Amino acid sequence: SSVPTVKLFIGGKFVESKSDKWIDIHNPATNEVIGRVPQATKAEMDAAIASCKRAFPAWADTSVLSRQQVLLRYQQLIKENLKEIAKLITLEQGKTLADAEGDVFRGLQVVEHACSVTSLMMGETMPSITKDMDLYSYRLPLGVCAGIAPFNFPAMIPLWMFPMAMVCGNTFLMKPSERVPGATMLLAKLLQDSGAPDGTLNIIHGQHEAVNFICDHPDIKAISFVGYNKAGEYIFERGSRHGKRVQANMGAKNHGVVMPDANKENTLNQLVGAAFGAAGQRCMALSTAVLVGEAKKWLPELVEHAKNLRVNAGDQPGADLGPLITPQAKERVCNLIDSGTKEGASILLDGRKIKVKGYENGNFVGPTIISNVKPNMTCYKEEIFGPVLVVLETETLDEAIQIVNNNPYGNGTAIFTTNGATARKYAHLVDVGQVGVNVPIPVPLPMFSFTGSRSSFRGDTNFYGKQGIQFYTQLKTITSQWKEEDATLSSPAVVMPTM
Amino acid sequence: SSVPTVKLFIGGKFVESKSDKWIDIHNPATNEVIGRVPQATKAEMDAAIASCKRAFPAWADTSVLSRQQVLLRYQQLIKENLKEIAKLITLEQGKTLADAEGDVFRGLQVVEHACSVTSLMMGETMPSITKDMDLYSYRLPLGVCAGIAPFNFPAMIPLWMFPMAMVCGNTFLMKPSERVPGATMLLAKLLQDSGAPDGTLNIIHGQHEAVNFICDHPDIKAISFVGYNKAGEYIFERGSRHGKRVQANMGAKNHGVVMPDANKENTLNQLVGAAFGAAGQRCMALSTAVLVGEAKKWLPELVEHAKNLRVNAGDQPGADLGPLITPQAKERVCNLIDSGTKEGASILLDGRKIKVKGYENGNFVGPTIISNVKPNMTCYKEEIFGPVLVVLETETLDEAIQIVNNNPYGNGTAIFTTNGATARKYAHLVDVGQVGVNVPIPVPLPMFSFTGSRSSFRGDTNFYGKQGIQFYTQLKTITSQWKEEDATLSSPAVVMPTM
Amino acid sequence: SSVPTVKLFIGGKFVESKSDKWIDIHNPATNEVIGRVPQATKAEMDAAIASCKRAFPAWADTSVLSRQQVLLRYQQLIKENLKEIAKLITLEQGKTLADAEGDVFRGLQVVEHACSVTSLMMGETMPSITKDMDLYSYRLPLGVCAGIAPFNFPAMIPLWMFPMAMVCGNTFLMKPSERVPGATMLLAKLLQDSGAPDGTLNIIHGQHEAVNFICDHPDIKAISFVGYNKAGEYIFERGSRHGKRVQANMGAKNHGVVMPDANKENTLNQLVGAAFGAAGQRCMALSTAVLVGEAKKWLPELVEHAKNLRVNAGDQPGADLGPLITPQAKERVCNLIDSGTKEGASILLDGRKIKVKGYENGNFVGPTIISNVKPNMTCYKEEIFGPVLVVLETETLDEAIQIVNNNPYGNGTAIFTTNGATARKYAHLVDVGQVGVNVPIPVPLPMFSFTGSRSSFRGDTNFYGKQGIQFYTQLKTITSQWKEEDATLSSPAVVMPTM
Amino acid sequence: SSVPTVKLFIGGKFVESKSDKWIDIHNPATNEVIGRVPQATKAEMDAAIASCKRAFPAWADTSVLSRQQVLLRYQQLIKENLKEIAKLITLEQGKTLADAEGDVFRGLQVVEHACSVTSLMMGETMPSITKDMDLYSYRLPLGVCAGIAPFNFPAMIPLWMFPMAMVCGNTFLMKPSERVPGATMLLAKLLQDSGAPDGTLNIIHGQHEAVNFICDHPDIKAISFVGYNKAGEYIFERGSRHGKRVQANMGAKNHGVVMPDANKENTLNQLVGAAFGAAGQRCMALSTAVLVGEAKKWLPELVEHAKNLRVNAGDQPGADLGPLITPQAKERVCNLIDSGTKEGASILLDGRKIKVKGYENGNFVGPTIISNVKPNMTCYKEEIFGPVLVVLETETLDEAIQIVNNNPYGNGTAIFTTNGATARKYAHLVDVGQVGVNVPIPVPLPMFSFTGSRSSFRGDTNFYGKQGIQFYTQLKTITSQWKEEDATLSSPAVVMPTM
């Protein structure tokens, strides 16, 4: 049977590629080829940005209401077609149907927060600041924008960058991930069906040449990347030279500090469902547990709670976590556990040799809890991105505050306790703004900004709120002085103002 | 006999430095030693940092209603001592008595904005993200802040860094310049005599031995600098490699485009006041005049207007422009003026050899106008920072717009015309942040922010305004999921909180 | 007599009425009977209000998202069904097809603006009132709204009144004009086909008895009216008798002041288009010329631009203007022209006596430029509402400003010039709320409202927009009187609280 | 026998009147003369408006940021001078030492919220919706405003008038009450010492001849008033006739609806502390009361709860009541309650002969709860303005909505129930916006607006809050169409789009 390949979105409809190099998309559950992704040459990637240059004016001159109604209808069109997108997400990423649907549900709250731009991208003006002096502020579209998507989220990250860039008057040159692009094509089909003009969103495929081409054309004003440190700094440096704005969200590693006063069962369940959920392939996991004081006596109970986790494909019911995105991720997460057990870290539960029934040739990795680890091994100083949970054994809360503040990468942190006087102290004494009391994963809901401090977030501005307008638009202040002499046409200006 | 030496402000008292190296502060109008600033030693800077740390907790725990009253009294003490603060800048920098007063006025105007915020404080809550789940945001200080001021404004820029930082719970270690420190020892005494605790503001001196300390000490978390590019980039790098926020404003080379339909008298009076005002030592000065169309016949009248400006010391009533800051600037300006004739220019007015009656030993440079200048010589691609005006001549507006958009040192622009359709197109076809129509000095008001440019600024948040408040504070969201679930103690909660 | 009759919308079905006062509708192009509108009996109005009050509760407890989706579907249907509405408009009123298309486009604009109500149905929220006493405020549906339509616009006023009214959760009564009720039938049909519940929108026909019922029934809380000032103040006092809020924006006669330095062609074309557009039967009509200075010599050219208008019917290719709605308007225009001739004013172009090929029976009045008009005749103080352009002559802009200020009715104006200050000190010296530079019709976008005057606006608020929400709703202020003294099953509220 | 005669505020400094007619003040404690109302005549009454107009341009040109510093310092000045104003209020108004303190505290909260108007006094400058077009709006001050205060709250009411007007750039001429001209004078003295230029606020004194002049003066553009049923409507009529925008909160007799399902340990205390506390004629106090169900059983219980509190002079601690304004008002209230006792309204607790020991000349009144009240009673429907609680004997729940709707003064209610559904259904079909579910007095926030539904109000817009800038400012919208074919003077403009 012919392997159904994906088609680019250059122009106004899906067009077939013309290159020769193909990337094989394997089913994470069965490791079976289910699609081919092209590697379009420089000519097609150039024609895409060219088509972006002939749709920018018609889209920018439109009103904010006309632009936001398209997204208002897009949100409903996606809401009525959530199962179709979730099925592709589960088939091409391995996430459970529940998590696959939750991902698309989270990708709609941004389109909902992108319809209220009419109250933001207007400007300010204050007259009579000086004798016949009046000021006006405006916000103009930047031009053509770009965006790269990682393997983690094939529907969340896509619906984070182009929606606001389009509702602000810009056109997007998107580059989906090289492992699961189907969701992006389905979302582009729904966007075209929602009444959006042609040439707004241009999809291009690739592995490493598209990333270079993105930061090559001087006609690119903004770039958005969610990916992990490795390609974050590279893209930032290569885009800062060409003279473009760059925003990035690198993979983080949140820390969870448990206290004795906290509820044992609830906190243990949250920790075991947040560090091993979705195969740990999330942008904000809880793989770093810190049992403080007496809390380090529930480790056997945590292992028991992690045992009952049903490791199975996302299509089968009753499953919690799925397989990994690629077979190489399994080798990496196995070498990490090997390095851990080499240095003496005791592994309570292991999943390197777990073979689920029905899906043999798969990347299924089970929960792997590690304890007695020091802050000097690769198990703690490296992103795991898998069903791994490292447990620390400190004495007091300050011994945890001093370690959760030195971690290189971090988006937020979690503190499981019931006393408010200590929770507020832990919140005020940390460098991460996304601190959650008894909350496993503090997520940056689209109604509020993101708090990536130093190394988990490159760039300056964000995607939504009052920071996405300041990233896809340019401010323009005009201070105009129109002398009073022209009140009548019988007197010129022979004076000047003061300060 | 002796020269008044500058002393440090460490702990709360004006203590004398114990260093052996000194830098002589001369009178730019007479080139006579009027003071001596010491190079702060390592122990003095360490004690300043310790004093800033000792008073950070008490200053952060204080409410905003008590922090803003200190500055409300400080702005009144400034308005009462304006005639004294304006008399030291003229003696140490050379600005006329009419310009130092305006600088102090613009400084107290920003102090008036650092108090009346009442909205960007700790934060505002927005509940209903999930069932009885809130997203309370808290705005916390950063810690010990730092600031390096240039010779351009010894009373305006200083009133831009610490007034906005100390109000948001933070402390400050202000590092004044090495040529005009006399205007900074009087702005701190009026702050200590205004109800400010001892330890909230420190002052250390030095040329480069203190900048290295400020950038290397891992306790400072915010640095603010204003000056040239060679030092701005160095400070930015040295402060970003350590992991602390750094903002650096750089000089600007504004461009003025004059149309034939403009007001001759008003345009000529506004151009000669923004090119030869304050001896051309300003941040945003109209150093370039692009005469478009038949407006090239106003050059003789422009020269005649630049020949009527009085060049004398600021103390002498009637002078419009003063001398330069240092003797090394007069030679640098004369070299760039001679470079015009070397590269084929036309110096219509020569101000290299001036003789002020009574001050023939100062760095007095008269108004200089250089016409027949192309965008390739050393007079168009260099920050003169002096009384030199380059006059370009074109015939269409599309060429002036291109010349304006073809310079990296330009952050603001100016258009002189009496038409409503010309200024709009000019402001719409140019790439700048601060546009001004018939405004010689389009300086942003305190309510606004100092919007930078590509090369004239490195960062995202400005010094003052709304962004200046966000620069000196950090955000932290606290997801609770701890609500009235046990308000009716009947049984513990064993259900998963879901949306 | 096979002409069809206009049905009602009681309950949701196109039911007929049983009466005998069937008012005939005459075609304005040929004065031929084209339909009969019945005068609803008291029983019909009773059934209509009964259905409205029955549907009010079912429509108030409905999710606003479903209302927005229904409004979006209605907007899409109106976009699709476009030629039918334009044909109905040009057949009932007689305006050109292009004018009807523009009217339907403005209708679609207001509808899509009403769709954007996701961030307007809620109220203000300010926490931290006192000790643990919060308050959550919203907006509730006011009740049974109503609306009367004028003859000037048969599709604009309905789409301005009933969609914004029913988008917040209210039922709406619609009293269509007794001369152009054709468009509202198709509008209500498309709205019902859009998924709206049967019974939310009701349409009652009549001439004067329906307006009395709407102003007498106690269940009709709010009403809306547009048209002359007579009936405006009539219904205003009738509602005040019962305590009803009724916005009665009537109309304004804007004044246009042209300067000698203006673009002759553009200004003289805009004046012709605004003074002889839609047969002069516009709300914000520019039926005045205040040519200042050397603009007097532009009189003849203007006349030529008025003679170049093809006076024809609505469906004739190339027709610019159309016929009048009723013979009463025609005879009033002829009487006003005769009075202007008798008062001394010189009429350059005479449109009173004109004949159209194949349409010599309909009420057809051509352009009439009445020059030499003073602010003391009858043509300057009257409601012409026809192709009449009174041309006042002056020599300075101050006299034009004075003539515009001493005008009883009128809230809009227009200035024409090619300067930057002549169009800046003219909007301030005048006393109006809508000024236009190079724009004859100063009406803003649906986002804003329609400012009015003594004889152009009555009631609480001006018209739709962000204020239309406040108009068709009530403010719900609900406090939070639950404290902590009874949190952990503790003593009741027995302690005395103080401020 | 020369009591201190209070002065007149015109020109900035306190001047004494010269008219032969004078009026004296009386201490409600023992009817002791305090001062003399400086009733003036056309001499200085006309010059006050001229003085306000002198400082009106200076205050309008001043930016909002500099205008709000005066109020920010006045906030602290009030916080300091709390007991100083409380003493004057207690010896002039005749209330307990805590009621004046609260009146000043909430009035201080008013001026605190009035300082946050820097962002809202800008307007809106929309970007280019169509090529070569823009729309910018302004809020400009009208002129010299005025306002009159009743003898209800000498601190609260004034603290809404000048803080909201002057902050918008206008000037105010306040006419405070004739009973307590001691608090407003000290408030204006503290305001002028805050940084207000002498002239931005004037204060006049007199009688009806003064408000008549305020109304008939042609140089006033706004009127803010608070009065009875007669004065409010009279002022509104006289203003609307003179072309004056009037906002007058009229008398309000509110309800105290009680329900059985509520802990009566505090509801009964609030019943007697709302309408009786120091002449509790507040616009939100619980004057009436509808006893339903078991609430009817608490007929003698509230009598004991009222006997718990004691009547005594305001200056003495432990006092809940206070001496009335005048003995004539005492006799008026006594006759009004006698009119009720003679028609069937039984008096359970008599308060007509409450002569507090020591105060035989003062106007002391006590609890006068009237029982057996019928809807058709005179005193139940008319304004009492005195300490009277008319408890209605009913047993209905759905008709209670009707009993509260029949009351024309729908400005205050109470819902003493524990179930939220009952309060919801009550607030659904209620005429008053401020519901009193489990609240002592539903006092809105300074940011909200406190108006009367239909009877206790005469006007369209709101009073204060963010609606503050809707009544003292004019909205000037400008839609400018600056073409692009005129920037280059070598392109004659002859094309114009006609749509």
Coordinates of C-alpha atoms in Angstrom, one line a residue, chain B residues 222-492:
Chain B
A222 CA 19.6 44.7 38.0
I223 CA 22.0 47.1 36.1
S224 CA 21.0 50.3 34.3
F225 CA 23.5 52.2 32.1
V226 CA 23.3 55.1 29.7
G227 CA 26.1 56.2 27.4
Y228 CA 27.9 55.3 24.2
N229 CA 28.1 51.9 22.3
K230 CA 31.6 50.8 23.1
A231 CA 30.9 50.8 26.8
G232 CA 27.2 49.9 26.6
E233 CA 28.0 46.6 24.8
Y234 CA 30.8 45.8 27.2
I235 CA 28.6 46.4 30.3
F236 CA 25.8 44.4 28.7
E237 CA 28.0 41.4 28.0
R238 CA 29.8 41.5 31.4
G239 CA 26.4 41.7 33.2
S240 CA 24.6 39.1 31.1
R241 CA 27.3 36.5 31.3
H242 CA 26.9 36.5 35.1
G243 CA 23.1 36.1 35.1
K244 CA 21.6 39.5 36.0
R245 CA 19.3 41.8 34.2
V246 CA 21.0 44.7 32.3
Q247 CA 19.6 47.6 30.4
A248 CA 21.8 49.9 28.3
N249 CA 20.7 53.0 26.5
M250 CA 23.0 54.4 23.8
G251 CA 23.3 57.7 22.0
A252 CA 21.0 58.6 19.1
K253 CA 21.6 60.4 15.8
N254 CA 18.2 61.9 14.9
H255 CA 17.3 63.1 11.4
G256 CA 15.3 66.1 10.5
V257 CA 13.5 66.3 7.1
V258 CA 12.4 69.9 6.1
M259 CA 9.8 70.4 3.4
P260 CA 9.4 73.6 1.3
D261 CA 5.9 74.2 2.6
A262 CA 7.2 74.4 6.2
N263 CA 7.3 77.5 8.4
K264 CA 10.7 79.1 7.6
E265 CA 11.1 81.0 10.8
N266 CA 9.8 78.3 13.1
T267 CA 11.7 75.5 11.3
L268 CA 15.0 77.5 11.4
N269 CA 14.5 78.3 15.1
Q270 CA 13.7 74.7 16.0
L271 CA 16.6 73.3 14.0
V272 CA 19.2 75.6 15.5
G273 CA 18.0 74.8 18.9
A274 CA 18.2 71.0 18.5
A275 CA 21.6 70.9 16.7
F276 CA 23.6 73.5 18.7
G277 CA 21.7 73.3 22.0
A278 CA 23.6 72.2 25.2
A279 CA 26.7 72.2 23.0
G280 CA 25.2 69.3 21.1
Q281 CA 25.7 67.0 24.2
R282 CA 22.3 65.4 24.3
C283 CA 20.8 61.9 23.8
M284 CA 18.3 62.8 21.0
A285 CA 19.7 65.8 19.1
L286 CA 18.9 66.8 15.5
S287 CA 22.4 66.5 14.2
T288 CA 21.2 66.0 10.6
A289 CA 19.1 68.3 8.4
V290 CA 17.7 66.9 5.2
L291 CA 16.5 69.8 3.0
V292 CA 14.1 68.3 0.5
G293 CA 12.8 70.1 -2.7
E294 CA 13.5 73.8 -3.0
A295 CA 14.3 74.0 0.7
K296 CA 18.0 74.1 0.0
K297 CA 17.8 77.9 -0.3
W298 CA 17.3 78.2 3.4
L299 CA 20.9 77.2 4.2
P300 CA 22.2 80.8 4.2
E301 CA 19.4 81.8 6.6
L302 CA 20.2 78.8 8.7
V303 CA 23.9 79.8 8.9
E304 CA 22.8 83.4 9.8
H305 CA 20.7 82.0 12.5
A306 CA 23.5 79.8 13.8
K307 CA 25.8 82.8 13.8
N308 CA 23.6 84.8 16.3
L309 CA 23.8 82.2 19.1
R310 CA 25.8 83.4 22.1
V311 CA 28.7 81.1 23.0
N312 CA 29.8 81.7 26.6
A313 CA 29.8 80.1 30.1
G314 CA 26.5 79.1 31.6
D315 CA 26.9 81.6 34.4
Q316 CA 27.0 84.5 32.0
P317 CA 23.4 85.5 31.3
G318 CA 22.5 85.5 27.6
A319 CA 24.5 82.4 26.5
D320 CA 22.7 79.7 24.5
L321 CA 25.3 77.0 24.3
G322 CA 28.2 76.2 26.7
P323 CA 31.6 74.4 26.4
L324 CA 32.2 70.7 26.0
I325 CA 32.6 68.2 28.9
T326 CA 36.3 67.3 28.4
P327 CA 39.2 68.7 26.4
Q328 CA 39.3 65.3 24.6
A329 CA 35.9 66.0 23.0
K330 CA 36.9 69.4 21.4
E331 CA 39.7 67.7 19.5
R332 CA 37.4 64.8 18.5
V333 CA 34.9 67.2 17.2
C334 CA 37.5 69.3 15.3
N335 CA 38.9 66.1 13.7
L336 CA 35.4 65.1 12.4
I337 CA 34.9 68.7 11.2
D338 CA 38.2 68.6 9.3
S339 CA 37.3 65.2 7.9
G340 CA 34.5 66.9 6.0
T341 CA 36.8 69.2 4.1
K342 CA 39.2 66.2 3.7
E343 CA 36.4 64.1 2.1
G344 CA 35.0 66.9 0.0
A345 CA 32.4 68.8 2.1
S346 CA 31.6 72.5 2.6
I347 CA 32.0 73.9 6.1
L348 CA 29.7 77.0 5.8
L349 CA 30.2 78.0 9.5
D350 CA 33.4 77.1 11.2
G351 CA 33.3 76.9 15.0
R352 CA 36.6 75.1 15.6
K353 CA 38.5 78.4 16.5
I354 CA 36.3 80.5 18.8
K355 CA 37.5 83.0 21.4
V356 CA 35.1 83.6 24.3
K357 CA 36.0 86.9 26.0
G358 CA 37.1 85.7 29.5
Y359 CA 37.0 82.0 28.9
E360 CA 39.6 81.5 26.2
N361 CA 41.0 78.4 28.1
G362 CA 37.8 76.3 28.0
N363 CA 36.4 73.7 25.6
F364 CA 34.2 76.1 23.8
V365 CA 33.1 75.0 20.3
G366 CA 30.9 77.3 18.2
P367 CA 28.1 76.3 15.9
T368 CA 29.4 74.4 12.9
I369 CA 27.4 73.7 9.8
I370 CA 28.7 71.3 7.1
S371 CA 26.8 71.0 3.8
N372 CA 27.5 68.9 0.7
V373 CA 27.7 65.8 2.9
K374 CA 27.1 62.4 1.4
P375 CA 26.0 59.2 3.4
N376 CA 29.5 57.7 3.1
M377 CA 31.9 60.1 4.9
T378 CA 33.0 60.0 8.6
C379 CA 30.6 62.9 9.4
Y380 CA 27.4 60.8 8.7
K381 CA 28.4 57.5 10.3
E382 CA 29.7 58.8 13.6
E383 CA 28.2 60.1 16.8
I384 CA 29.6 63.7 16.9
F385 CA 28.0 64.7 20.2
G386 CA 28.8 68.4 19.6
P387 CA 27.7 71.6 17.9
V388 CA 28.0 70.1 14.4
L389 CA 25.1 70.0 12.0
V390 CA 25.3 68.1 8.7
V391 CA 23.0 69.4 6.0
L392 CA 22.0 67.0 3.3
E393 CA 20.2 68.1 0.1
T394 CA 17.6 66.1 -1.8
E395 CA 14.8 66.7 -4.2
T396 CA 12.1 64.1 -3.2
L397 CA 10.7 62.7 -0.1
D398 CA 11.4 59.0 -1.0
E399 CA 15.1 59.8 -0.9
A400 CA 15.0 61.5 2.5
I401 CA 13.0 58.6 3.9
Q402 CA 15.6 56.2 2.6
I403 CA 18.4 58.2 4.0
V404 CA 16.6 58.2 7.4
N405 CA 15.9 54.5 7.2
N406 CA 19.5 53.8 6.2
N407 CA 21.2 54.7 9.5
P408 CA 21.6 52.5 12.5
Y409 CA 22.3 55.3 15.0
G410 CA 18.9 56.8 14.6
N411 CA 16.1 56.2 17.1
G412 CA 14.0 59.2 16.5
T413 CA 13.1 61.4 13.5
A414 CA 11.7 64.9 12.8
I415 CA 9.5 66.2 10.0
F416 CA 9.0 70.0 9.4
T417 CA 6.0 70.8 7.2
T418 CA 2.6 72.5 7.1
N419 CA 0.7 69.6 5.4
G420 CA -1.3 66.8 7.0
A421 CA -0.6 64.3 4.2
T422 CA 3.2 64.7 4.2
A423 CA 3.9 64.0 7.9
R424 CA 1.6 61.0 7.9
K425 CA 3.4 59.4 5.0
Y426 CA 6.8 60.3 6.5
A427 CA 5.9 58.7 9.8
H428 CA 4.3 55.6 8.1
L429 CA 7.2 54.9 5.7
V430 CA 10.0 55.2 8.3
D431 CA 11.3 52.6 10.8
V432 CA 11.7 54.4 14.1
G433 CA 10.1 54.3 17.6
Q434 CA 9.8 58.0 18.5
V435 CA 8.4 60.1 15.6
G436 CA 8.0 63.8 15.9
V437 CA 6.1 66.3 13.7
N438 CA 7.3 69.9 14.1
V439 CA 9.0 68.9 17.4
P440 CA 12.7 69.6 17.8
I441 CA 13.3 67.4 20.8
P442 CA 10.8 64.5 20.7
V443 CA 11.8 63.3 24.2
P444 CA 9.2 60.8 25.6
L445 CA 7.3 62.1 28.6
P446 CA 7.6 60.4 32.0
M447 CA 4.2 58.7 31.5
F448 CA 5.7 57.1 28.4
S449 CA 8.8 54.9 28.0
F450 CA 12.1 55.6 26.3
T451 CA 11.6 53.4 23.3
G452 CA 15.0 52.5 21.9
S453 CA 16.0 51.3 18.4
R454 CA 18.1 48.6 16.8
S455 CA 21.6 49.9 17.7
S456 CA 20.7 52.8 20.0
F457 CA 19.5 50.4 22.7
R458 CA 20.1 46.8 23.8
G459 CA 17.2 45.3 25.8
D460 CA 13.4 45.1 25.9
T461 CA 12.3 47.3 28.8
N462 CA 13.1 51.1 28.8
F463 CA 14.3 53.2 31.8
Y464 CA 11.2 55.1 32.9
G465 CA 7.5 54.8 32.1
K466 CA 5.4 51.6 32.3
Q467 CA 8.2 49.3 31.2
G468 CA 10.6 50.8 33.7
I469 CA 8.3 49.7 36.5
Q470 CA 8.2 46.1 35.1
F471 CA 12.0 46.1 34.7
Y472 CA 12.7 46.5 38.4
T473 CA 10.2 43.8 39.6
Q474 CA 9.5 40.0 39.2
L475 CA 6.2 38.2 38.8
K476 CA 5.1 35.1 40.6
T477 CA 1.8 33.2 40.1
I478 CA 0.6 31.0 43.0
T479 CA -1.9 28.3 42.0
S480 CA -3.6 27.3 45.2
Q481 CA -6.0 24.4 44.7
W482 CA -6.4 24.8 48.5
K483 CA -9.8 26.2 49.2
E484 CA -13.0 25.6 51.2
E485 CA -13.0 21.9 50.5
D486 CA -12.6 21.0 54.2
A487 CA -14.7 24.0 55.5
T488 CA -17.3 21.4 56.4
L489 CA -15.1 18.7 58.1
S490 CA -17.0 15.5 57.5
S491 CA -14.6 13.4 55.4
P492 CA -11.3 13.9 53.6

